[model samples]
Target chain A: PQITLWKRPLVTIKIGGQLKEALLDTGADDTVLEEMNLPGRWKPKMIGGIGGFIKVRQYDQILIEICGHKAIGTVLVGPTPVNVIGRNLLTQIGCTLNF
Target chain B: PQITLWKRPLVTIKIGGQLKEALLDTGADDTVLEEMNLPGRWKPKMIGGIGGFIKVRQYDQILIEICGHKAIGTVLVGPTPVNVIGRNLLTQIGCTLNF
Candidate 1:
């Protein structure tokens, strides 16, 4: 599937068997999701963004589906304003920057 | 120009007669740069991201060259970790997301 970059490159993703909308953030190094419950143990990590940094729970080996593309990667859950699909997951889905 | 998103989609940009590298951030609505000297009056604004929100000086009508494409848009300057090229300028360059 192809995605055109408008003002915001937003896409639907499934995490923990729930559908959620996430922003395709190439600036981010790792995926950050809103607060959610996970089965396994997670490590506390801080991620920096354009504004500042925030503490999040780094959960590894999480299953995520982005536009029907299934992948397993690290997902950070915290008090995020929105779900961000970063480069970690973007690489798995073969996303490209076209001009 | 076509850029393959291997990990982070970074590109060279020219701003204010200086060359700098910036991350192509689709999640960010406006461009944000590190602290720099600009010659104009700017309004203060706050932008929120995955972490939280930070105060920034919004400078309008700034010229930016991204990958050989020239565009003029709003550019925010503040205490930023890295330069971010957001959708405000990306749209002018006709950037697209391809999968």
Candidate 2:
């Protein structure tokens, strides 16, 4: 027998200009957001990081709906291949990575 | 009006060795099953892909529970930075990509 590491809780939300699915990886350290799918307008600032800080180009504050749960957060536009749920979000959900 | 992409559907299942959530993704061309969270034991073969065919690598088979749906599929064990749901599972669910 083995253990599981990732989980996907359906929280139907919009991001990247088309409706798609997002995997909630609690193991993820930072909040991964999709700028294209986000709604509304915002002014983003450059966040620099190669090994320490991310070199962000801009930012935006948007509202996300997860299933029935909703929350407002900041979206970072960068060269992130995948979107991850970070510490700030884990705290909001009140859950931790055990596996 | 703008459109949205990336949807997260809650699916509770066991992978590697832990119980977690999985997001149903049709956009994902390949199914990315977590080796650490996957349960059961099976031999796997490596696939080389620095630019082409993946180097042969032994892999494992596991059970995946999504919402009330479940399926069994062969998992390819490789150096995947992220877990993705690919063609095999998508056909099983009878869904297609629109976004």
Candidate 3:
């Protein structure tokens, strides 16, 4: 599937069997999700972005489904403007940037 | 050309005769650049992201060459970790997210 950037590249994602919308962000170093309860061990971590850094909980080996593709990777949970699918998960789903 | 997500999708861009590297960010709503001397009338603006929002100067109708593709768009300048090419300019260059 090809997604044009004519609009925000938002897509449907499945996490813990819950459906959510997220953006596939190539500029992001890690994927950050909004406040969502997940059962697991997470370490407090800090990540920097366009504005500044924010403290988040890093959960590893999490399973997520993106556009019908299943991916296992690290997922950060914290306060974010939106759910962002970074390169980490994008790679697992075989997402690429084409011109 | 296709860029794999195995690494950061950084590409060389020509702006005002200066060559620099930038990331194609699908999660961003607007393009933002590091502090640079750009000729034009700009307005003060603010943009938000994963962490928070930051103050930026908006310059419209700026010509930029991304991977040899020319695009004119609004470029925001301020202190940033890196230069980001948002969807605003990506569409012009026919950049798309594919799986």
TM-score of chain B of each: 0.93, 0.52, 0.96
How much does candidate 2 score in TM-score? Answer: 0.37
Model 1 Cα lDDT, one tens digit per residue, A25-46: 7777888999988888999998
Instruction: Candidate 3: list runs displaced more than 4 Å.
Output: none
What is the DockQ score, from 0 to 1, of model 1?
0.70
Summing lDDT over every window of 10 consecutive residues in candidate 2 chain A, give the lowest-scoring window. A1-10
> What TM-score does candidate 3 get on C-alpha atoms?
0.97
The order by descending lDDT is: 3, 1, 2
Give the per-residue lDDT digits (tens) of candidate 3, residues A1-99.
999998888889999879999988898878999989887889999988876788889999999999999999999999988889999999998999999
Query: Lowest-lDDT window of 10 residues in candidate 3 chain B?
Result: B46-55
- All candidates: DockQ: 0.70, 0.04, 0.87
Q: What is the TM-score of chain A alone in each candidate?
A: 0.92, 0.54, 0.96
Clashes of each: 0, 70, 0
State the C-alpha RMSD over the true interface residues for candidate 3, after superposing those residues. Answer: 1.0
**Candidate 3 lDDT score relative to the true structure:** 0.90
